[PDB]
């Protein structure tokens, strides 16, 4: 049942007054349109007025709540998703409570955890190295630490912001700060924006590439029509292609100007079409954007009908709160059957 080649994008950034002493992330700024002046708005996270277009079954939960973490792991078991890639924000995340709990809870059910390296302040080949060292030293011995073909896997969000020649210092065998053939080696997966920039993956000496964005066509790389061709490139260049599939997209609470990126779920049709494209590409690994990026409306996490004075939330009606967990399990089984064939 439980698939070790299916990886959800997991966010551990949520906090509440009960567990953390303040709202975290459920309270969120409202972003200005690109190139525009203005004051930055705020959604308080209070009075059920929260920074997302859907409303969680688990409410304004804390990522540091062991009961929530237990429930999230159980939801992955329901979805047959065996791997979570947790958002990682650099030094500020050293020793953070949620990661240890996630590992502990994953280990009880045979789930695994890998890391999604985010664009933290001062990110560079050197500080990425330091973070890999921290992650491997602190979590690498954990029974639930993910390895595939014997190697840890790291996704690197917006990696293209650091030049390939700089990455090569870290990822080339001869690189000046190389992790290759050290205890810090693994599979490093860069975010690609377009098929035509795939050579940058090779120049950077990365092991593969992923697409992240759940909204079809937001980038060339997140356009499913291009997935067969990208897989072909990956195979020809000894790289791992990891498409990212999502159930929809909407982020207009946090980005009111961003309606062009909205993708309706159409009672699961959007997810079906995208997941089928990912399987049909021939990729060996599939990533899911997202388990719980609530701000961007990409979550497969159960959502409920909800209204407050300030907002009426979207929801999954007339389908079950857990529809997207159920439907994920279906697609994971289709994926396993395709890979077996």
- Any bridge partners for residue 114, and if so which? 85
| Beta strands in the chain, from DSSP E residues, in sequence order | 3-10, 28-30, 41-43, 81-88, 112-117, 153-156, 187-191, 208-210, 240-242, 244-245, 286-288
* DSSP alpha helix (H) spans, 25-163: 66-79, 97-109, 125-139
Q: How was this structure determined?
A: X-ray
Query: What does the alpha-carbon distance between residue 44 and residue 25 come to, in Å, rounded to a whole number?
Result: 9
**Closest by alpha carbon to 204, among 164, 155, 174?**
164
CB 102 within 8 A of CB 85: no
Query: What does the alpha-carbon distance between residue 190 and residue 260 come to, in Å, rounded to a whole number?
Result: 25
Query: What does the alpha-carbon distance between residue 253 and residue 248 come to, in Å, rounded to a whole number?
Result: 15
N residues, the chain: 341
Query: What does the alpha-carbon distance between residue 132 and residue 139 come to, in Å, rounded to a whole number?
Result: 10
Coil, helix or strand for 153?
A: strand
162-195: string of b/e by CB count within 10 Å (b at 16+)? Answer: bebeebbbbbbeebeebbeeeebbbbbbbbbbbe
Please name the residues in contact with 176: beta carbons below 8 A apart, sequence gap of 6 or more: 169
> Before 103, cis peptide (omega within 30)?
no
- Any bridge partners for residue 28, and if so which? 43
**Closest by alpha carbon to 314, among 331, 327, 297, 301?**
297
* Pairing of β 28-30 and β 112-117: unpaired
Q: How many C-beta atoms surround the C-beta of residue 260 within 10 A?
A: 8
The CATH class that applies to domain 1-341 reads: alpha beta
Coil, helix or strand for 310?
A: coil
Query: What does the alpha-carbon distance between residue 20 and residue 23 come to, in Å, rounded to a whole number?
Result: 7
The kind and range of the H/E element at 325 are helix 323-340
Positive or negative, the CA dihedral 180, 282, 228, 114 is negative
Please name the residues in contact with 85: beta carbons below 8 A apart, sequence gap of 6 or more: 7, 8, 9, 10, 113, 114, 115, 116, 153, 155, 287
What region, left, alpha or beta, does residue 113 occupy, with left being phi > 0 and alpha being psi -120 to 50 degrees? beta
């Amino acid at each position: 049942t439980l698939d070790d080649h299916t990886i959800s994008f997991y966010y551990n950034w949520y906090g509440n007054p009960s567990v953390d002493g303040e709202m975290k992330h459920w309270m969120h700024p409202i972003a200005l349109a690109p190139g525009h002046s203005g004051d930055v708005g705020a959604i308080s996270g209070l009075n059920d007025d929260i920074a997302c277009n859907f409303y969680p079954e688990l409410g304004t939960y804390s990522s540091n709540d062991p009961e929530i973490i237990r429930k999230h792991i159980r939801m992955h078991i329901k979805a047959n998703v065996g791997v979570l890639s947790v958002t990682w924000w650099g030094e500020s995340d050293y020793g953070n409570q949620s990661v240890s709990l996630l590992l502990d809870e994953a280990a009880k059910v045979g789930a695994k955890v890998c890391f999604h390296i985010e664009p933290f302040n001062g990110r560079s080949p050197q500080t990425v190295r330091e973070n890999i060292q921290y992650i491997v030293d602190t979590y690498g011995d954990h029974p639930a630490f993910y390895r595939t073909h014997g190697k840890p896997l790291f996704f690197i969000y917006d990696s293209y912001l650091i030049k390939p020649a700089e990455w090569a210092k870290l990822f080339a065998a001869g690189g000046e700060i190389s992790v290759r053939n050290t205890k810090y080696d693994g599979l490093f997966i860069g975010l690609t924006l377009k098929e035509s920039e795939l050579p940058d993956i090779e120049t950077a000496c990365m092991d593969g590439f992923y697409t992240y964005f759940a909204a079809t066509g937001f980038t060339n790389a997140s356009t499913p029509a291009n997935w067969k061709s990208m897989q072909q490139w990956a195979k020809a260049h000894n790289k791992l292609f990891i498409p990212s599939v999502g159930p929809g997209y909407i982020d207009t609470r946090i980005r009111p100007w961003n309606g062009s990126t909205t993708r309706d779920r159409e009672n699961g049709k959007y997810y079906d079409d995208m997941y089928k494209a990912a399987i049909e590409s021939g990729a060996s690994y599939i990533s899911i954007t997202s388990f719980n990026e609530w701000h961007e409306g990409t979550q497969i996490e159960p959502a409920v009908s909800k209204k407050c004075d300030a907002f009426e939330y979207l929801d999954y009606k007339p389908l079950a709160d857990d529809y997207y967990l159920i439907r994920t399990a279906y697609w994971v089984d289709e994926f396993r059957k395709a890979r077996s064939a």
